[model samples]
Target chain A: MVGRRALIVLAHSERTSFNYAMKEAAAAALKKKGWEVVESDLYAMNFNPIISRKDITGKLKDPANFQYPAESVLAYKEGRLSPDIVAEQKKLEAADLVIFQFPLQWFGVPAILKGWFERVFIGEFAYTYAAMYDKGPFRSKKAVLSITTGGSGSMYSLQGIHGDMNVILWPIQSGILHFCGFQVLEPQLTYSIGHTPADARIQILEGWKKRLENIWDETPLYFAPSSLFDLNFQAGFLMKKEVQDEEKNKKFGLSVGHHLGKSIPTDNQIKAR
Target chain B: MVGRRALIVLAHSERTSFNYAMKEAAAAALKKKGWEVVESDLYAMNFNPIISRKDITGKLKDPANFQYPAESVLAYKEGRLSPDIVAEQKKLEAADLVIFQFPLQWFGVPAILKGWFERVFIGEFAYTYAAMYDKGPFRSKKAVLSITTGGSGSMYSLQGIHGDMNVILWPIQSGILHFCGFQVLEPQLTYSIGHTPADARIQILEGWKKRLENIWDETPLYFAPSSLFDLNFQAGFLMKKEVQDEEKNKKFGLSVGHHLGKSIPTDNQIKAR
Candidate 1:
């Protein structure tokens, strides 16, 4: 039957992991909600995680000098991106919501997931000049990160020795999801999975299941919009002086630059903000 | 004659690319300074960037759970880590300085390199309980990211549309390098390589060669010291209130909670900080 499509991309190596359980929970919940669920189980799919000339098959934009960004863009527009990339892009284009399920590695997405971004998020197709952030092609889509962390919750807090989780997540949440014009949902984080009690782990999964029931209507996280920027290709993507001044005195921001509303202060418990 | 050793790991798809040239310049500079230079050309080596049960050969510590952090650490200690990882680790263990050479992908290291960290940076070897940051096992070693970017320098600044260079780099620089106790050096960034003049590209490479000559004696960038933390595994790794009070009003920090001395403002040029 026809229904809203959602893609769940999982990148963990183990099939019997807490991460896998989270994925299963999400899939079941989404399916029960009358949504069409598609999966890109990266490891099970043995998804190639490296980019090379092979990614462009028919011909290169510049055969002599290989520029992946340029070549991949032409490939996408010409329908010549690698079979896997083309296949992944179709799932991406069809989905109204996308969920990335993985175990955080080195404070970033697993390389398999990172590769998914590199190979599938081709230029011209995913984004182009003066067409990023809120103004990009996929402005109607929404995405959220469902991740497991080996570290305890406190260790990932604002003052924790590890560092603030929000700061650690900017490049992925902001750079990847928001930059591509997806309405970013606050990250669905599962912390200290290896140390959590079995019952507690189930509780986290159940919470995720309950949250999915309202996933389609949840308010997306706020990121600085392209309207705040001057947007001159040669001039740069700096925030406008007026916008920066308007946001200057705000209590919190992602950086010293424009505010992305990342004014979250974290504590040592697993709770959604 | 014996001398210091430096490991230059290259993770570019193209062998004749500017990234490779930077790797070459680094090797030559290290060799000219009478230091032993070892290379881990990831693409050339056809290194596997994905992690799985194959990464651990011997009997896993947990036959059922298959916790990667736990299993990989055991495998590493038992001399049963994947062959490629073991080989990479040998190079890492023997190096006085390690330089990561690659093109930035998706505001972070390429997936190939991200996988390298996932599989090779085994816990207890790279870091462990109460032994990270300034107290990490690799504390005596030095590491720096030598990267090229597709966007111009202005696009990665404080008020720039993309975001602050330091803020974008916190997870990798602080979470990975500094957390593992490597003396983090300022990243050697070559920006807008695709758009820069050929002459400017040569100048950047020449500057890298010059930097390597004084790399050994160069003072490492400042990160929050471990002494500032109370170091209770259960109490969480939150920054001590006293330390927070002392650093509260400081001009810049990686986050609002703790100060990593990332008080950096950026501009439009490929100059080293």
Candidate 2:
């Protein structure tokens, strides 16, 4: 616990907006927990979200051909990654927990934050062909999505026009976080907080702080283990037929395909816009 | 048909990348069909992927506060948006079909193109509480996701370890395009194109050209019409119990949930990463 640290990557343009408040609130809460909390206040730092040849200070993998993945690997190995990317990578390496804080844009991370992934979580450093998913280098680390939404919970529900929240987040949670081998905590979603009453906002912020107080005990979201897939052929990554047949009656477990392993969604789960 | 026009947005840093090839092929194919083709080559333009107060040249919605959505709506109404945003929005407005061409990054568009949506699809201009989804202002328009991926389609298949491809793309296709009233076309996916042979790449590129030739006759992807949800109360946007009762026996229709209305996935669909 003493050596533990947390890196909170936040993306918001407004300093006075609720997203910023959430960022400040999270930092304070994690600090109170005696964690060395590092903040990548993306906008304040004027972080450039575009990735290109500039991301690497070292010689290119193919001088005429600029591919970020290969160039990033070489830069990372030679300690020649652009200072900004290295600065972020160093913080990420030291953190035991990573919290992505942002307002949902297009049902995914904002471009600023998405660019962080593209620029920083490059090949080799984040994952290799062999060391991805459950075997990923960062599997020991834990992460959570702390997000604010413009719409209410119901609007993102299964029957809701926006679609299921877990499904909406599958790419992020499973594809990004889980692929990197981080044990992903259930998302901390504070919905429709943009124009909420001051009293409600206070309660929501307080709730977030309270959640952080006991976050260590929170359960990680369910996802199919690599063992369930074709272990002999990582290339045959689909779940084994035996496994599927065994659980076909029970609804697939912890799967992104079947409502994130939850029951079939109904209107009872949420509301309209 | 003579007046029909298409806009293609491409995002890839490397000019020689397969994604660029796809874009070129699309442009040539569209032009051959007597359609006016416009291209927004994001990487060539060095598009800024960040969204901030600079997005607008107009007076702030709340001068002391920097809320992008509110300010964007104002800028859009006043025609005072930044030149870059205005330029892209004009292209979008003039297009009958919009094609997003990019390499699949973390199962979504690159940050550069994602930022295009964030900066351009402002409130009031892109959508309003009274008009979105099927009722969206761009109801007459169409859009498609033309993408290349490092991994094969199987890796993103239903039972594949990466999770279902359709679900992974729901956020982009439905949340962004459909929310703004685009009749979404079936995605054109070229898997593992990064290092493929020139012959295979040519075949794939040619295939795209052929697809574009008859694209106008292609069916849009199925999505539940707004009529399926509660009509009297848009606030209660979930599918009515009556609709669910009618569909409980059938797999959901064009709905984002439940494997996108296909049968449950199996290993036959794809291989692992």
| Number of the predicted model whose lDDT against the real structure is largest | 1
The residue-by-residue lDDT of candidate 2 on A1-273, one tens digit each, is: 456799999898778888889888988998988889999999889998888889878467788767777777888888888899989989989999998999999889999889888889878888877766888878989988888988877677666767678667778887888788888887888887765799999988999988888786666876667777774344566778887777777643445553333343332112111
For all predictions in the order shown, the interface RMSD in Å is 4.1, 3.9
User: Chain B TM-score in candidate 1, rounded to 2 decimals?
Assistant: 0.91
Candidate 1 wrongly placed segments (more than 4 Å)? A248-273, B248-273
**Every prediction's TM-score for the first chain?**
0.92, 0.90
Question: lDDT per residue, candidate 1, B1-273, as tens digits?
Answer: 147999999999787799999999999988998999999998899989888889989687778777777788888788888888888988999999999999988999999899899888988888887587888989999999898998888887666788767667778888889889998887898888888888988999999999899988876766667887768875577778788788777665544224333343232112233
Per-model lDDT: 0.80, 0.78
Please give the lDDT score at residue A65 for candidate 2: 67
Q: In candidate 2, how many Å is residue B145 off?
A: 0.5
Model 2's C-alpha root-mean-square deviation from the true structure amounts to: 4.0
lDDT of 1 at B56: 86
Q: Where does candidate 2 clash, by residue pair?
A: A154-A270, A154-A271, A235-B272, A237-B272, A272-B237
Error of 1 at A83 (Å): 1.2
